[PDB]
């Protein structure tokens, strides 16, 4: 029954009712369904026109919000000094939704999602005073974002001809320009992503449960197209996806533990009374106390 | 050209802005939509799901045995069994539910509830209970002729192991608030309290203390408004193997 | 009326004293992969009543220590029946799966099963940063057992698991549950040897009691493919 | 990566016990508690406290007010009131944790930088 | 929780199957990393999650069980302080050598 439904349901009136056999009130929870009683056959009520609307409760009003998925920094000097492995000048990071767990426990609340994804870039520069205290001036840097699908080989360095961008989805932009925003499609190999897999990868035996690479979206490999100046910066970037066109299937209980890992979903549980192991709801004194109750 | 005018509020990333943005991917062909069951459209659905609530979330009680009340044959009249103190919006057993981790999630709410509660005793036992609504004003009643003079309902265990109390849809405004754990006019809910109306009468080869499991949906009345980031989840650092996401 | 009901899957058939109404899981009955939904361009094999026929696992005794209990699906019945020997020698699959929930004790007993199908039910391990291993997951159909059922061992809360389909096994009420499972998979085809569709978990609420001599109560359950094909067909592995 | 800490060792009477820690490899802002740990003659291998680039400050003993500066990518520590007990080797780490809710699990040092052996006399 | 890392000062030679044991107050999980001091120097992380090694390690060393034994096992000889710390509640560091 699809039933367009735009605002709450109205109620109507009720009278005294004595009728024997029927009996609204009276349930079977054993059945798994929800009880089928209204206001009406419980309580004698009255007439309400309910102007009360819906639409804020909607899935695509649910989720279509800009959310935090990466934050990383990485530094704009000259790296001669072996160390800062895989982040000079540049970084990389798969795509993935388990890391800020707002987010994640949203998506989280159903078992497979359609939706195409809607990318922001933000960016921020900072002078570094590592070994002075002289702020000279914040430069306007253009930086570039590349779309590696996931299993294609990424830019190693930020030197490398790996960014001249063939066929790879590319962008420029400049730290004072708005932060520069695209669409990803969705780009699944099935019908809907898998929020949740309960499988493992490939077919041999040691396959990482849980992480199903057709869910990988794919990889974003960053770097600071200009060459590094006489001075060092550090430059902070902050990825923001909102989903678009959502479809949702199945939903699931929210997570009620900490996540630990963003991998897997292994729990361990707070320390004391709320969202523990032994405890998920905080205690109270006995089920005959009230937590605050009115005393005048 | 067209003279174009910049106002205020230009180049600025609304978190929450509908625009059409840049296609990545051009002339991209996504999957053919398949039918899999279990679509949800609206968040309203599954707020209509009865689930358990932790009545007893006491110490003594770990793990799964706050999740049932365990109710004993009495040898005084009138005997309170268990108060549920309605707040859906903050800490308490109604907070790990269905209705209330969605409602933690938006500000304000409206509609009414409905509580069931199931017996879980031998089919040998008999007993009747009374649950208790009483409306915000006042503190909660610990007698049960103060009790009865809100809404209630009484009710007789037998065939049919489950009875609905509905929780109307009692306030002056539309809406009611989160807006603190608090005691507010405009927040509160009111209690809802179990007494004994008879007594719980066991025969000698049946467990003499019968628990009692508590359900708590919402019904189509239900609304929620002014959605905001919940409270349930939070964290102080990255979590683990989120570095190897660089890497 | 709603409480006899007769199940007849092949040549194997169910009669139930104390039924609970038996549900289908989001208001679905399963079907044959239509022409547009199927990708896979060959004949599927469509054995019916060789498999999809009540295949019934081994039953586990209902204790006061025990937690609770779950099986994967198609894990499960991988290796019994015809059913197995398909999914052997064939590299996809697409199944109903039909489930019964059988649990008898006398009018002086009292618990309360919640015998809930989880789909992806994607478990983690308690207390450790690294993720199950194979032989954590992969248990069979001699199944697994909760350890932390209040949080259905992935974090997040059994009293929310009425969201899934599911039923309830009330001792004075009734004392089978049955429930019936679409596909229910983002793909129209699987391979079942890697990947579990469902997970029927059954965890005791009410822990059993009673009074009396306190004699042996186990807990049978009753798997059933449902419209079952099957596509590939190479070597057995 | 490579960490590299300087203060003063061998003076020290009563006054705050300032050392500071230089964060070469790793950009201090990305995570992994950056803390502080002794090896007294006293005790043996005593952790101090640590902090997250979000100014958390666990510590152990509360008076050492640990701070952070991912601006000149360094840490320092601060014990106070100094006598004779805090005599040790003062080593400057970090451990992948989780302090996710006011206490730490599996806080593993995986760098451990070089020791600085502060001296309480006169 | 405090951590009893110290059976002895145990000595063996070259080609040995030495074997250090840790035992801890409480029933802590997997939490378990094993260190290598060497005389002079700072120390370094052999194992952690109480059976897996590090990146840029010898490959001669292994890990016990959860719970509460927590031993550890060189099998090739070839020194150094080796500590136990438990990494549960805090940072311990269990005393503790060869």
């Known amino acids: 029954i699809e039933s367009i439904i735009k605002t709450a349901t109205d109620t109507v009136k009720s009278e005294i009712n004595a009728e024997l056999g029927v009996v609204p009130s009276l349930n079977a929870v054993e059945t798994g369904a929800t009880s089928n009683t209204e206001p009406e056959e419980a309580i004698q009520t009255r007439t309400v026109i309910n102007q009360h609307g819906v639409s804020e409760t909607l899935v695509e009003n649910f989720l279509s919000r800009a959310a935090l998925v990466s934050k990383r920094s990485f530094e704009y000097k000259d790296h001669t000094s072996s160390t800062a492995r895989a982040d000079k000048n540049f970084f990389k990071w798969t795509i993935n939704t388990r890391s800020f767990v707002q987010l994640r426990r949203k998506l989280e609340l159903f078992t497979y999602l359609r939706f195409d994804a809607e990318i922001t870039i933000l960016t921020t520069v900072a002078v570094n005073g590592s070994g002075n205290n002289t702020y000279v001036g914040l430069p306007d840097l253009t930086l570039q974002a590349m779309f590696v699908p996931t299993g294609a080989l990424t830019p190693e360095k930020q030197d490398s001809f790996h960014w001249q961008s063939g066929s790879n989805a590319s962008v420029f932009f400049k730290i004072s320009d708005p932060p520069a925003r695209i669409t990803i499609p969705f780009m699944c190999i099935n019908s809907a992503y898998s929020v949740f897999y309960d499988g493992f990868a490939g077919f041999e035996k040691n396959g990482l449960y849980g992480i199903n690479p057709a869910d990988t979206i794919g990889n974003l490999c960053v770097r600071i197209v200009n060459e590094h100046q006489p001075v060092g910066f550090t430059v902070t970037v902050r990825v923001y996806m909102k989903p678009k066109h959502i479809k949702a299937w199945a939903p699931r209980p929210p997570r009620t533990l900490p996540y630990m890992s963003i991998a897997n979903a292994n729990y361990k549980g707070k320390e004391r009374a709320p969202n523990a192991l032994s405890a998920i709801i905080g205690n109270r004194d006995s089920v005959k106390t009230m937590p605050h109750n009115i005393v005048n | 050209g067209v003279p174009t005018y910049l106002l205020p509020g230009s180049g600025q990333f609304l978190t929450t802005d509908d625009h059409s943005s840049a296609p990545a991917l051009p002339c991209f062909n996504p999957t053919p939509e398949m039918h899999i069951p279990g679509q949800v459209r609206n968040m309203l659905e599954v707020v209509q799901v009865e689930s358990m609530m932790e009545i007893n979330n006491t110490e003594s009680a770990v793990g799964m045995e706050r999740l049932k009340v365990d109710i004993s044959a009495l040898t005084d009249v009138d005997q309170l069994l268990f108060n549920i103190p309605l707040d859906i919006q903050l800490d308490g057993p109604l907070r790990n539910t269905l209705v209330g981790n969605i409602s933690r999630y938006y500000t304000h709410w409206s509609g009414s509830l409905e509580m069931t509660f199931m017996f879980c005793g031998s089919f040998m036992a008999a007993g009747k209970l009374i649950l208790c609504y009483t409306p915000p004003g006042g503190s909660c009643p610990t007698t049960r002729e103060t009790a009865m003079l809100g809404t209630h309902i009484v009710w007789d265990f037998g065939l049919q192991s489950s009875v609905t109390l509905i929780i109307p849809w009692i306030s002056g405004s539309h809406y009611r608030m989160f807006n603190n754990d608090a005691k507010s006019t405009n927040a509160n809910v009111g209690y809802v309290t179990c007494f004994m109306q008879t007594n719980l009468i066991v025969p000698s080869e049946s467990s003499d203390t019968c628990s009692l499991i508590g359900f708590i949906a919402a019904k189509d009345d239900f609304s929620l408004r002014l959605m905001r980031d919940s409270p349930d989840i939070g964290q102080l650092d990255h979590l683990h193997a989120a570095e190897a996401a660089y890497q | 009326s709603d409480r006899v009901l007769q199940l007849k899957l092949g040549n194997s058939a169910i009669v139930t004293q104390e039924a609970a109404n038996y549900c289908c899981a989001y208001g679905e009955w399963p079907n044959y992969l239509p022409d547009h939904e199927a990708v896979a361009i060959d004949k599927p094999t469509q054995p019916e009543t060789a498999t999809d026929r009540f295949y019934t696992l081994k039953s586990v005794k209902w204790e006061t220590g025990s937690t609770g209990w779950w099986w994967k699906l198609p894990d499960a019945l991988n290796n019994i029946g015809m059913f197995g020997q398909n999914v052997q020698h064939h590299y996809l699959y697409r199944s109903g799966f039909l489930i019964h929930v059988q649990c008898n004790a006398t009018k002086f007993h009292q618990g309360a099963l919640l015998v809930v199908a989880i789909p992806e039910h994607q478990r983690g391990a308690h207390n450790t940063n690294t993720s199950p291993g194979f032989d954590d997951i992969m248990k069979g159909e001699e199944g697994g057992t909760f350890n932390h059922p209040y949080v259905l061992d992935d974090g997040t809360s059994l009293a929310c698991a009425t969201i899934f389909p599911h039923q309830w096994i009330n001792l004075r009420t009734n004392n089978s549950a049955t429930i019936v499972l679409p596909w229910m998979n983002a793909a129209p085809m699987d391979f079942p040897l890697r990947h579990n569709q469902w997970t029927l978990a059954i965890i005791p609420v009410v822990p059993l009691g009673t009074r009396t001599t306190s004699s042996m109560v186990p807990i049978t359950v009753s798997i059933a493919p449902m419209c079952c094909e099957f596509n590939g067909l190479r070597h057995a592995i | 990566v490579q960490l590299q800490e300087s203060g003063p060792g061998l003076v020290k009477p009563s006054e705050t016990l300032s050392l500071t820690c230089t964060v070469s490899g790793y950009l201090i802002s990305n995570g992994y508690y950056w803390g502080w740990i002794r090896q007294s003659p006293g005790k043996g291998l005593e952790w101090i406290g640590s902090?997250?680039?979000?100014?958390?400050?666990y510590y152990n003993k509360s008076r050492i007010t640990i701070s952070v500066d991912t601006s000149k990518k360094q840490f320092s520590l601060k014990l106070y009131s100094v006598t004779a007990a805090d005599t040790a080797v003062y080593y400057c780490?970090?451990?992948?944790?989780?302090?996710?809710?006011?206490?730490?699990?599996?806080?593993?040092?995986?760098?451990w930088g070089q020791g600085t052996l502060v001296t309480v006399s006169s | 929780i405090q951590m009893t890392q110290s059976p002895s000062s145990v000595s063996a030679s070259v080609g040995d199957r030495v074997t250090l044991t840790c035992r801890a107050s409480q029933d802590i999980s997997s939490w378990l990393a094993w260190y290598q001091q060497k005389p002079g120097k700072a120390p370094k992380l052999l194992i952690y999650?109480?059976?897996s090694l590090q990146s840029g390690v010898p490959s001669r060393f292994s890990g016990s069980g959860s719970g509460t034994h927590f031993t550890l096992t060189i099998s090739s000889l070839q020194f150094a302080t080796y500590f136990c710390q438990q990494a549960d509640s805090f940072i311990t560091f269990g005393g503790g050598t060869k």
């Open positions: 999650a109480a059976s």
């Open positions: 902090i997250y680039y979000t100014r958390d400050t």
């Open positions: 780490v970090r451990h992948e944790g989780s302090c996710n809710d006011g206490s730490c699990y599996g806080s593993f040092v995986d760098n």
